[PDB]
Amino acid sequence: SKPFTLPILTLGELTNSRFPLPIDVLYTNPNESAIVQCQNGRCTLDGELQGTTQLLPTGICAFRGKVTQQVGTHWNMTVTNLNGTPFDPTEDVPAPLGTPDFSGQIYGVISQRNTNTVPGEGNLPANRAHEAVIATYSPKFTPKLGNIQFSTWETQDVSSGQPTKFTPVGLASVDANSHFDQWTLPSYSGALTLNMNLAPSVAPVFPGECLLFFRSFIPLKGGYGNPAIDCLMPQEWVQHLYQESAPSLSDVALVRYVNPETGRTLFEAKLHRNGFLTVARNSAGPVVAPTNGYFRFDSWVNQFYTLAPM
């Protein structure tokens, strides 16, 4: 039986699995009323990706496809799998892997490199890129059906029928009107249709315990706010667990957040089979801990184990 391990990486060496951002802090929010059911950064401890999760850091909240027509200014674009193959709505996933998993106005850059080349230009293609926003709560956001819409400030310099890439950067806004809610899933097929093939919701099932998140702060195109995105495990853990494919020997692994300098355990946590952490903590907010710290697998325990309060 290949033993279970986590990579040895401080918070400053980890990245968020739900948006292309570094991890900034560990965070808890015991009194959260929302169901936590994100679809990116989902991976079982034995290395099975779930939801819309894929392995590339560059694939998180990215889209690939072709603009079909103009419809600020608005544009419709077909979306393929990120590897360029046609997305097959019959595959057992919620949406193309990499699709954003939260409601909001996602701000980024749309770029295009034409397929046709010009002989006068050494047989090279024309290009354009422009800022763009994708509203994931809109009824035109239907990645599961192979089509989404984005808007631009630019009014004309976007070409139909040409290869198109969305590179995410941040959020456009977090004002009331922008519907930013990190725990509200998009309707991947539109509002009249149920989401399918989701990774399951996660929650603590032990008194005194709460979810522990890896939190990143996300840039804003304008306006006021300090929005955050919380993931259940960083992208490097997803990648590592996928590589190792270690059998889970129980439903719950005991992990310790250790200070390598002093060799001391700062706190302990449960790492659950479906790929998320809980701690025994009675407050909300960031965890204040030495920047050299990281989680180390200790042993397999079970649902009856009582964590020492942080």
Ligand X SMILES: C[C@@H]1O[C@@H](O)[C@@H](O)[C@H](O)[C@@H]1O
Residues, the chain, total?
310
For residue 40 the two structure tokens come to 């990116």
Question: Judged by CB under 8 A, which stretch of 136-144, 167-175, 260-268, 270-278 contacts a copy of itself?
Answer: 167-175
Strand order, beta sheet including 73-79 = 105-118, 163-171, 63-70, 73-79, 147-152
Residue partners of 198: CB distance under 8 A and separation at least 6: 37, 39, 51, 94, 185
Residue closer to a copy of itself (CB basis): 208 or 290? 290
Q: Is 128 in the site for ligand X (CB under 6 A)?
A: yes
- The Cα–Cα gap between 249 and 227 comes to 38
Q: Is 175 in the site for ligand X (CB under 6 A)?
A: no
Count other Cβ atoms within 10 Å, centred on residue 302. Answer: 10
Residue partners of 208: CB distance under 8 A and separation at least 6: 280, 282, 309
Count other Cβ atoms within 10 Å, centred on residue 185. Answer: 21
Q: Is 226 in the site for a copy of itself (CB under 8 A)?
A: yes
Residue with tokens 């929010």: 29
Q: Is 154 in the site for a copy of itself (CB under 8 A)?
A: no
Q: Is 61 in the site for a copy of itself (CB under 8 A)?
A: no
Residue closer to ligand X (CB basis): 91 or 175? 175
CB of 61 to a copy of itself, least distance (A): 12
Applying CB under 8 A, among 30, 147, 149, 217 the residue interacting with a copy of itself is: 217
Identity of the residue numbered 211: L
Identity of the residue numbered 206: F
CB of 35 to ligand X, least distance (A): 32
Q: Is 239 in the site for a copy of itself (CB under 8 A)?
A: yes
Residue closer to ligand X (CB basis): 150 or 237? 150
User: Nearest to ligand X by Cβ — which residue?
Assistant: 222
> Site map for a copy of itself, 11-50, x if CB under 8 A?
-xxxx----xxx----------------------------
Count CA atoms closer than 13 A to 212's CA, side-chain side.
23
Residue closer to ligand X (CB basis): 128 or 256? 128
Nearest to 24 by CA among 262, 226, 280, 274: 226
- The Cα–Cα gap between 211 and 302 comes to 17
Applying CB under 8 A, among 70, 83, 155, 306 the residue interacting with a copy of itself is: 83
Nearest to 25 by CA among 309, 285, 296: 285
Q: Residue 238's binding partner, choosing from ligand X, a copy of itself, none, with beta-carbon cut-off 5 to 8 A by kind?
A: none
Q: Is 222 in the site for ligand X (CB under 6 A)?
A: yes
Q: Residue 239's binding partner, choosing from ligand X, a copy of itself, none, with beta-carbon cut-off 5 to 8 A by kind?
A: a copy of itself
Per CB under 8 A, residues contacting a copy of itself are 7-9, 12-15, 20-22, 55-59, 82-83, 107, 109, 111, 113, 118, 121-122, 124-129, 131, 165, 167, 169-170, 217, 219-226, 235-236, 239, 243, 291
Per CB under 6 A, residues contacting ligand X are 126-128, 157, 222-224
